[PDB]
Structures are given as C-alpha cells and as structure tokens.
Design a protein around this ligand. Structure first.
Ligand SMILES: *[C@@H]1O[C@H](CO)[C@@H](O[C@@H]2O[C@H](CO)[C@@H](O[C@@H]3O[C@H](CO[C@H]4O[C@H](CO[C@H]5O[C@H](CO)[C@@H](O)[C@H](O)[C@@H]5O)[C@@H](O)[C@H](O[C@H]5O[C@H](CO)[C@@H](O)[C@H](O)[C@@H]5O[C@H]5O[C@H](CO)[C@@H](O)[C@H](O)[C@@H]5O)[C@@H]4O)[C@@H](O)[C@H](O[C@H]4O[C@H](CO)[C@@H](O)[C@H](O)[C@@H]4O)[C@@H]3O)[C@H](O)[C@H]2NC(C)=O)[C@H](O)[C@H]1NC(C)=O
Ligand SMILES: *[C@@H]1O[C@H](CO)[C@@H](O[C@@H]2O[C@H](CO)[C@@H](O[C@@H]3O[C@H](CO[C@H]4O[C@H](CO)[C@@H](O)[C@H](O[C@H]5O[C@H](CO)[C@@H](O)[C@H](O)[C@@H]5O)[C@@H]4O)[C@@H](O)[C@H](O[C@H]4O[C@H](CO)[C@@H](O)[C@H](O)[C@@H]4O)[C@@H]3O)[C@H](O)[C@H]2NC(C)=O)[C@H](O)[C@H]1NC(C)=O
Ligand SMILES: *[C@@H]1O[C@H](CO)[C@@H](O[C@@H]2O[C@H](CO)[C@@H](O[C@@H]3O[C@H](CO[C@H]4O[C@H](CO)[C@@H](O)[C@H](O)[C@@H]4O)[C@@H](O)[C@H](O)[C@@H]3O)[C@H](O)[C@H]2NC(C)=O)[C@H](O)[C@H]1NC(C)=O
Ligand SMILES: CCCCCCCCCCCCCCCCCCCC(=O)O[C@H](COC(=O)CCCCCCCCCCCCCC)COP(=O)(O)OCCN
Ligand SMILES: *[C@@H]1O[C@H](CO)[C@@H](O[C@@H]2O[C@H](CO)[C@@H](O)[C@H](O)[C@H]2NC(C)=O)[C@H](O)[C@H]1NC(C)=O
Ligand SMILES: *[C@@H]1O[C@H](CO)[C@@H](O[C@@H]2O[C@H](CO)[C@@H](O)[C@H](O)[C@H]2NC(C)=O)[C@H](O)[C@H]1NC(C)=O
Ligand SMILES: *[C@@H]1O[C@H](CO)[C@@H](O[C@@H]2O[C@H](CO)[C@@H](O)[C@H](O)[C@H]2NC(C)=O)[C@H](O)[C@H]1NC(C)=O
Ligand SMILES: *[C@@H]1O[C@H](CO)[C@@H](O[C@@H]2O[C@H](CO)[C@@H](O)[C@H](O)[C@H]2NC(C)=O)[C@H](O)[C@H]1NC(C)=O
Ligand SMILES: CC(C)CCC[C@@H](C)[C@H]1CC[C@H]2[C@@H]3CC=C4C[C@@H](O)CC[C@]4(C)[C@H]3CC[C@]12C
Ligand SMILES: CC(C)CCC[C@@H](C)[C@H]1CC[C@H]2[C@@H]3CC=C4C[C@@H](O)CC[C@]4(C)[C@H]3CC[C@]12C
Ligand SMILES: CC(C)CCC[C@@H](C)[C@H]1CC[C@H]2[C@@H]3CC=C4C[C@@H](O)CC[C@]4(C)[C@H]3CC[C@]12C
Lengths: 148, 58, 23, 92, 23, 58, 43
C-alpha cells in the first residue's frame, strides 16, 4: 500500500529502553532520510527540535526478540503520481509480483492523463519531473519551455 | 514602385512561411511530449530494502 | 588589545540500526 | 433507468487510445461476449492479430501511426498550398 | 550497523597585545 | 605554371610583411618592460606600526 | 435534444458525432478525384 503524505514529514518515537525510532523526510544529527532507524546517543543532544537523551545503563539478560527475513521491493517509476490522483491509500503491488503485471496495472489510467488546452504549463512541468531521471537533457529543455 | 509591388509579394510569402512553420512546431511538440510520457510510464522504478548502512551520508 | 573566540572541535556518538520490512 | 444513469459517463470516458488498443479491444470483447457472441469472436481475433501475429509488429505500427496524426495533418496542408499554386500557374 | 560522529559547537578565548617597535 | 609564378610573388610579399612585424613586436616589448621596471623601482612602499588591532581578521 | 419530438435530434447528433472518422475518410477521397478530373481538363 502507498499513500501520499505532506512534506516535511518528521516522526520520532521515544522507545522504552531509551533509544528513539526515527522516520523523517530530512536529515539531522547525521541520521539518513526516508529509511527508518533505531537511534541511540552517548550524550544528550538536540535533534529535530527535541532532546535525545543518553539512556541509563542496563543489565543484560537472555533475549527473545524476533529476527525477520530481509526483503528487496521494486516499485513503479511513477508511484508518487499514482498515490496522488487517488487521494486515498491504494494498493500498488504485491511482494512477489512480476515486472510485467506491475506495469499493466495503472498504464491505461496514466495514459489518459493527456495534454489539455487549459493546463498545458502545469502538464509540461509534470512531464519534466517524470523525465528528469530518464533523460536529464530533455527535462531541462521542458522546464525552460514551461517557465516561458 | 516596382520595389513596392515586389515588397507586397515578398511580404505575403514570408507571412505564409511564418504560419506553416507554427503549424509544424506545435504539431511536433504534441507528438514528442506525448511519446515521452508513454516512455516515462514504462521505465523501471526504484528498489527499497530497509538497509540504513547503504544510505549513510558522511 | 584584541579579544577573540576560537572554535574548538567536539563530537557526540550516534548509533543506528535497521528494521527489516519496516516491522 | 436510474441504475443505468449512474456509471455511464465514467464508462464512456474509458475511450480507445494509441497506446493500449489491443488491451482495449480484449476488454470490449469480454463486454460484448454475452450480447453478441459473433462480434466477440471477431474482436478477439483482431485483438490477437495486433498482439501475436509476427512480433506484434502491426500493434507497434498502428500505435506509432496513431501518435503521428498531428504531424500528418500539418504535412497534408503544405501539399495543398503547393498544388493550388502549381495548378493556377498552368491556367492561361 | 552504522556508527557516526556528530560535530557539537564550542569556543576558547584568546587575548593579544602589541610590542611597540618590536622591542 | 602561371599560378605557381603568381603564388611565388604574393607569397614573398606576405613573408616579408611577416618578418617586418616580428621585428616591431620584440622591439616594443623590450622598450615597455624596461620602462615599467624603472617605474616599479620608484613607487612608494609599505608602512608598519606594530598595531595588532589593525590586523584583526574575523 | 432530450424532449422535443421523441428526442430524435439528440439521437442524430449522437450518431453524427460517432461517425466523424468515416466522414473525413470520404472527404479526402472526393478531393483526389476532383484534382485529377481538373488537371485532366487543363490543355
Ligand atoms: C532498544 O531495543 C532495540 C531492539 O528492539 C535495540 O536494537 C537491536 O539491538 C541488537 C543488539 O542487541 C541488534 O542486534 C545486533 O544486530 C547486528 C546486525 O545484524 C545484521 O547483520 C549481521 C551481519 O551481517 C553481515 O555479515 C554477515 C556474515 O557474518 C553477512 O552474511 C551479511 O551479508 C552482512 O555482510 C547478520 O548476522 C544479521 O542477520 C540476522 O538478522 C536478520 C534480520 O535482522 C535475518 O535476516 C537473518 O536471518 C539473521 O538472523 C538469523 O541468524 C542469526 C545468526 O546468523 C541469529 O542470531 C538470528 O536469531 C536468526 O536466526 C543481520 O543481518 C549483529 O551483528 C549483532 O551481532 C552481535 O551479537 C551476536 C550474537 O547474538 C554476536 O555473535 C556478534 O559478534 C555481535 O556481538 C546483533 O545481533 C538488533 O539489530 C537491533 N534491532 C533492530 C530491529 O534494530 C536497541 O539497540 C535497544 N536500545 C537500547 C538503548 O537498549
Ligand atoms: C519479484 O522477483 C522477480 C524475479 O526477480 C522480479 O522480476 C524480475 O525483475 C528483474 C529486475 O528488474 C528483471 O530482470 C531483467 O530481465 C531481462 C530479461 O528478461 C527475460 O529473460 C528472463 C530470464 O529468466 C525472463 O524471466 C523474463 O521473463 C519475464 O518477462 C517476459 C517479457 O515481458 C514475460 O513474458 C515473462 O512472463 C516474464 O514476466 C524475460 O523473458 C534482462 O534483459 C534485464 O537486463 C537488464 O538488467 C541487467 C542487470 O542489471 C543488465 O546486465 C542488462 O544490461 C540490462 O540492463 C534484467 O535482467 C526480470 O525480467 C523480472 N522477471 C519477472 C518475472 O518479472 C519482480 O519484479 C520482483 N517483484 C517485486 C515486487 O519486487
Ligand atoms: C554504538 O555501538 C558501539 C559498537 O561499535 C558501542 O560500543 C561498545 O560498547 C560496549 C559497552 O559495554 C563496550 O564494552 C566496554 O568495554 C570496556 C573495555 O573494552 C574492552 O572490553 C570490551 C568488552 O568488555 C571489548 O569489546 C573491547 O574491544 C575492549 O577489549 C570495559 O571497561 C567496559 O566495562 C565495557 O565492557 C565495547 O567495548 C564497545 N565496542 C566498540 C566496538 O566500540 C557503543 O556503546 C554504542 N554507542 C551508542 C551511542 O549507542
Ligand atoms: C519487410 C518486413 C515486414 C514489414 C511489415 C510492416 C507492416 C506495416 C503495418 C502498417 C499499419 C498501418 C496502421 C495505421 C493505423 C492508423 C491509426 C491512427 C489513429 C489512432 O491511432 O487513433 C487513436 C487510437 O486508435 C487506434 O489506434 C485504432 C487503430 C485500428 C485497430 C484495428 C486494426 C487491426 C485489424 C486486424 C484485422 C485482421 C485480423 C485477423 C483476421 C484514437 O484516436 P486519436 O488518435 O485521434 O485519439 C483520440 C482518442 N479517442
Ligand atoms: C547494507 O548496506 C551495506 C553498505 O552497502 C552493505 O555492506 C557492505 O557489504 C559488502 C559485501 O556485499 C562489503 O564489501 C562491504 O564491506 C560492506 N560495507 C559496509 C559499509 O558494511 C550490506 O551488505 C548491506 N546489506 C545488509 C543486509 O547489511
Ligand atoms: C560520546 O562520543 C564521542 C564520540 O566522538 C566521544 O568523544 C571522545 O572523547 C574522548 C575524551 O574522553 C577523546 O579522547 C576522544 O578523542 C573522543 N573521540 C571519539 C571519536 O570518541 C565523547 O567523549 C563521548 N561521551 C560520552 C558521554 O560517552
Ligand atoms: C574559555 O573561553 C570560552 C570562550 O568562548 C568560554 O565559553 C563559554 O562557556 C560557557 C559554559 O560555561 C558557555 O555558556 C558560554 O556561552 C561560552 N561563551 C563564551 C564566549 O564565553 C569557555 O567556557 C572558557 N573556559 C575556560 C576554562 O575559561
Ligand atoms: C591601532 O589600530 C586600531 C584599528 O585600526 C585603531 O583603533 C581605531 O581607531 C579609530 C580612530 O583613529 C576609531 O575610529 C576606531 O573605532 C578604532 N577601532 C578599533 C577596532 O579600536 C587604533 O587607534 C590604532 N592605534 C593604536 C596605537 O592602537
Ligand atoms: C483558419 C484556417 C486556415 C484553418 C486552420 C486550422 C488549423 C489551425 C487546424 C486544422 C486541424 C488542426 C489539428 C487537428 C488535430 C491535432 C491533434 C492534436 O493532438 C494536436 C493539434 C492538432 C495537430 C490540430 C492543430 C490545429 C489544426 C492544424
Ligand atoms: C499519409 C499522409 C499524406 C498523411 C495524410 C493525413 C491523414 C493520414 C490524417 C488526416 C486526418 C487524420 C484523421 C483525423 C481523425 C481521426 C480520428 C481517430 O480516432 C481515428 C483516426 C482519424 C480518422 C485520423 C487518421 C489519420 C488522418 C486521416
Ligand atoms: C462531404 C462529406 C465527406 C461529408 C463531410 C462532413 C463534414 C462537413 C464534417 C465531418 C466531421 C465534422 C467536424 C467534426 C468535429 C468538429 C468539432 C466540434 O467541436 C465542432 C464541429 C466540427 C469542427 C465538425 C465540422 C463539420 C465536419 C468537418
């Protein structure tokens, strides 16, 4: 499932053991964006506008924590557009799904977002954003025509 | 006066060439932009794998 | 007379770990 | 009547496109099957011609000639503007 | 695993005075 | 043949002009450079006053 | 379009609207005949 969200996105959950769980659209205190992580600090500091404390020392015991498999997941090239035009949390893929089945899913929909007399500049700007990664030399050209 | 009569003719040829070229320019842009949108739909998209170490910034 | 403020280096240690499948 | 005038406009605007013509034709056959079995068999056949005779070359061709429509009109207009002047320059 | 060093601000105070004629 | 003979005339004029220019270029450079060295020698030099505050950088 | 007659003009304009691609194809053929007939009358 995919869902469009408002930028900037910051989430910081204080965990009970003293670490913090972070998911954020932007970097602070070295923490990478977009991928979530469990964060711990040796000394109290301010990050994302709030104080990450050093935890109290703990005594070790036998663990029963689960260890899930890792997983690599491919998404459609335009996933941000597909989530956007729905306005709701929408199913985009399955864990196992082939390249071909994944593509034939939104294609007819996406093709029917065609160029119109009323919003050509807006449409051209979206084409540039979509083309940027594929053909940078075409995206800069389309951007210039769009601002003209 | 022959130059004036010749000017009225040369003018109407450059005015005609002006419009025929605009017809071509717009017709080409609509073709290309639409094709590139088609191509953009079918390119391979991104991969995620939750690996923090891969996304470190120094 | 001249009074000046020289920056001096320091660090905090930050550790990070992954969450497979985001679970 | 009310039950029909509910999705009609939405369904009509799923129209034929230069991209996915084969895929569209197969949906039309599935929709037509119960209504007119003869026409469904013909549509399904025209579908598999575009997709699976040769390497789908005709499906590629008709897709491309589709996208080129605006160019082709803009050329045809230039030809008439040559022909008319040439013909008028023959008449005494 | 990822271990990082984050820079934290600090200063030292330095005072200077002149030597007329370099004597 | 006539082209070779004519080429030989036009060539010798351009080759003569080429050298007469090089003579001039070198002769000018030596004049100007030596005068500028003279001028450089006679310009006012720096001032020192042991004032630390004057040479603060922020 | 809806309620005058039995809604026949709404039927007519709907039908004429679907036929548009056929009508252009016919119109093209008429020009091709005309140009040849015409060029064949010039001395
Ligand atoms: C607050 O709470 C949170 C938890 O809620 C705390 O965070 C947790 O803290 C734990 C430490 O106590 C972390 O555990 C540590 O994880 C390290 C990373 O593990 C991954 O990498 C390993 C190495 O991979 C590389 O090297 C191998 C070859 O050796 C290559 O094959 C790889 O390609 C890499 O190059 C790897 O072994 C691990 O694999 C296991 O986990 C993944 C899922 O994460 C599974 O896909 C795997 O199947 C595998 O699990 C199975 O197999 C292993 C044995 O191989 C079993 O142990 C499992 O039970 C299961 O059967 C990961 O990919 C580890 O390196 C680190 O190891 C230490 O401990 C072991 C003994 O247990 C020693 O032998 C080592 O030498 C080392 O000392 C340790 O396990 C948790 O990751 C972390 N949890 C999360 C979700 O982040 C937080 O810190 C707390 N904070 C406070 C303040 O208390
Ligand atoms: C779940 O897991 C599957 C399996 O990994 C994922 O799908 C696969 O994704 C990879 C990576 O994008 C694709 O790899 C490319 O494969 C082509 C060659 O494909 C042809 O040969 C394959 C031989 O095994 C065959 O499976 C393929 O069949 C599929 O596609 C055909 C045609 O559309 C279709 O009819 C079939 O039904 C199958 O669906 C096909 O015959 C190869 O040319 C690519 O090369 C590029 O990449 C390499 C490596 O970087 C590079 O060296 C080359 O230069 C070039 O740049 C590339 O290897 C693979 O095709 C996908 N297979 C399927 C079944 O989809 C799936 O996406 C994962 N899901 C999710 C949600 O993540
Ligand atoms: C971030 O991750 C780090 C791992 O890279 C964490 O560092 C580890 O923290 C433990 C805390 O128990 C240290 O253990 C201490 O060790 C000293 C003496 O060091 C020697 O002995 C240890 C094992 O006892 C051995 O690992 C060392 O190599 C030395 O041989 C003892 O005096 C202490 O009592 C205590 O046992 C680890 O040594 C240390 N390892 C490394 C690789 O740094 C760090 O704490 C994490 N920090 C944050 C911000 O979360
Ligand atoms: C030497 C090696 C070998 C070489 C071989 C080379 C072969 C070359 C083949 C050439 C084929 C020429 C095809 C010309 C097609 C022109 C299409 C132009 C119009 C077009 O695309 O229109 C759009 C989509 O419709 C369409 O796309 C409709 C197209 C028609 C589909 C049906 C055709 C298949 C019929 C199969 C019959 C036989 C079956 C087997 C018994 C819709 O309109 P719009 O563009 O204005 O957009 C407004 C949206 N509403
Ligand atoms: C997570 O990302 C890191 C960084 O790309 C991967 O770690 C590297 O693994 C290769 C072998 O594939 C080694 O040559 C490097 O020395 C490793 N670098 C670092 C910074 O660790 C790691 O394999 C990825 N996957 C997992 C599950 O950790
Ligand atoms: C928290 O982590 C930083 C990591 O940079 C520690 O810095 C070290 O401090 C000692 C003094 O005790 C210096 O000699 C080292 O050169 C520093 N370098 C590094 C990279 O560790 C910092 O002191 C730590 N503080 C706490 C409370 O753990
Ligand atoms: C040496 O000088 C620096 C000059 O920057 C002092 O820094 C101050 O430290 C206090 C902590 O007690 C901070 O709250 C102040 O904001 C700092 N600023 C300034 C300009 O003083 C440093 O503490 C001094 N240390 C010693 C040993 O004298
Ligand atoms: C040393 O240099 C400083 C900086 O140029 C001089 O102090 C300045 O004096 C002028 C007036 O002459 C004032 O307008 C400035 O506001 C002063 N600036 C500062 C930073 O003090 C100083 O007078 C010089 N001479 C000596 C002997 O100290
Ligand atoms: C006033 C007289 C001279 C007639 C001028 C008519 C011109 C401007 C009309 C005739 C047919 C028109 C074309 C018909 C179809 C398309 C496809 C569309 O996707 C892009 C524009 C394009 C290419 C049109 C642009 C304008 C056009 C060329
Ligand atoms: C072959 C060269 C000279 C180009 C000549 C222009 C021709 C091919 C152009 C001019 C107008 C075009 C038509 C205009 C509108 C439509 C509607 C569309 O839904 C199906 C195709 C169809 C019917 C077009 C097919 C191509 C067309 C007939
Ligand atoms: C002589 C034979 C071939 C019949 C020709 C019928 C002609 C006159 C028909 C066929 C298709 C028609 C056009 C189809 C579509 C439109 C767009 C609409 O917004 C206004 C009417 C307009 C511009 C029509 C004008 C008349 C038209 C050109």
């Amino acid at each position: 499932w995919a869902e469009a969200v408002k930028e900037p996105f910051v989430q910081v959950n204080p965990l009970k053991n003293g670490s913090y769980l972070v998911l954020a659209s932007s970097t602070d205190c070295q923490i990478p964006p977009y991928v979530p992580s469990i964060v711990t600090v040796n000394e109290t500091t301010s990050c994302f506008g709030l104080d990450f404390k050093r935890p109290l020392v703990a005594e070790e015991r036998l663990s029963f924590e689960p260890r899930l498999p890792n997983l690599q997941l491919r998404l459609p090239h335009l996933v941000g557009i597909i989530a956007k035009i729905k306005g709701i949390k929408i199913e985009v893929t399955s864990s196992g799904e082939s390249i071909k089945e994944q593509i034939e899913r939104a294609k007819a929909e996406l093709l029917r977002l065609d160029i119109h007399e009323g919003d050509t500049p807006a449409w051209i700007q979206q084409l540039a954003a979509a083309t940027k990664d594929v053909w940078p030399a075409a995206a800069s050209a389309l951007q210039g025509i769009g601002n003209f | 006066y022959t130059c004036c009569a010749t000017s009225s003719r040369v003018l109407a040829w450059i005015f005609l060439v002006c419009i025929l070229l605009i017809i071509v320019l717009v017709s080409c842009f609509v073709t290309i932009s639409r094709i590139q949108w088609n191509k953009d739909i079918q390119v391979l998209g991104p991969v995620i794998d939750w690996n923090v170490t891969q996304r470190a910034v120094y | 007379s001249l009074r000046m403020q020289h920056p001096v280096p320091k660090y905090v240690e930050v550790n990070m770990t992954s969450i497979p499948q985001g679970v | 009547k009310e039950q029909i005038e509910r999705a009609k406009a939405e369904l009509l605007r799923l129209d034929i496109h230069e991209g996915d013509t084969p895929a569209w034709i197969q949906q039309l056959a599935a929709a037509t099957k119960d209504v007119w079995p003869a026409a469904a068999s013909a549509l399904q056949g025209i579908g598999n011609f575009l997709s699976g005779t040769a390497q789908g070359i005709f499906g590629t061709a008709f897709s491309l000639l589709g996208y080129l429509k605006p160019i082709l009109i803009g050329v045809g207009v230039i030809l008439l503007v040559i022909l008319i002047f040439k013909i008028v320059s023959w008449i005494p």
